[PDB]
Amino acid sequence: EDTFKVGLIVPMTGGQASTGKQIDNAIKLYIKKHGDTVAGKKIEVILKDDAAIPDNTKRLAQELIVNDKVNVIAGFGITPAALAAAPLATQAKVPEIVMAAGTSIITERSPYIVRTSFTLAQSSIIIGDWAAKNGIKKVATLTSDYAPGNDALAFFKERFTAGGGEIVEEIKVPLANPDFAPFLQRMKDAKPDAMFVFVPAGQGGNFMKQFAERGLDKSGIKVIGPGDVMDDDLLNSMGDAALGVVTAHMYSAAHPSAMNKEFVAAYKKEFGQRPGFMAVGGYDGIHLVFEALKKTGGKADGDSLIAAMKGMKWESPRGPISIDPETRDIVQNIYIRKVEKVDGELYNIEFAKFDAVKDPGKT
Domain boundaries, the chain: 1-118+256-332, 119-255+333-363
Say which CATH architecture domain 1-118+256-332 belongs to.
Answer: 3-Layer(aba) Sandwich (3.40)
Q: Are 73 and 63 in contact (CB under 8 A)?
A: no
| Residue (of 282, 265, 281) closest to 273 by Cα position | 265
Nearest to 14 by CA among 205, 202, 143, 146: 202
CA distance 134 to 164: 11
What one-character DSSP code corresponds to residue 228? G
Angle at alpha carbon of residue 30, lines to 63 and 77, rounded to 5°: 45
With beta carbons less than 8 A apart as the criterion, state whether 70 and 88 touch. no
Of 245, 219, 214, the residue nearest 232 (C-alpha): 245
**Inter-CA distances, 121 with 103, 126, 155, Å:** 8, 9, 6
Return the amino acid letter for 165.
G
Backbone angles phi, psi at 230, to 5 degrees: -95, 45
Task: Report the amino acid identity of residue 242.
Answer: A
Q: Which residues contact 26 (CB under 8 A, 6 or more apart)?
A: 267, 275, 278, 279, 280, 281, 282, 283, 286
Measured distance CA(109)–CA(87) in Å, rounded: 8
Elucidation technique: X-ray
Q: Is 323 left (phi over 0), alpha (psi -120 to 50) or beta?
A: beta
Which residues are within 8 A (CB) of 223 and not within 5 positions of it... i.e. 6 or more apart?
Answer: 194, 195, 197, 211, 229, 244, 245, 246
Instruction: Report the alpha-carbon distance of residue 124 to residue 266 in Å, rounded.
Output: 30
- Residues of the binding site for 3,4-dihydroxybenzoate: 79, 102, 146, 201, 228
Q: At what angle do helices 17-34 and 277-295 cross, to 10 degrees?
A: 40
* DSSP-assigned beta bridge partners for residue 6: 45, 72
Please give the annotated binding residues, written as ranges.
79, 102, 146, 201, 228
- Give whole-number Cα distances, 225 to 9, 149, 188, 204, in Å: 28, 11, 19, 11
Same fold, 1-118+256-332 and 119-255+333-363: yes
Q: Which fold, 119-255+333-363?
A: Rossmann fold (3.40.50)
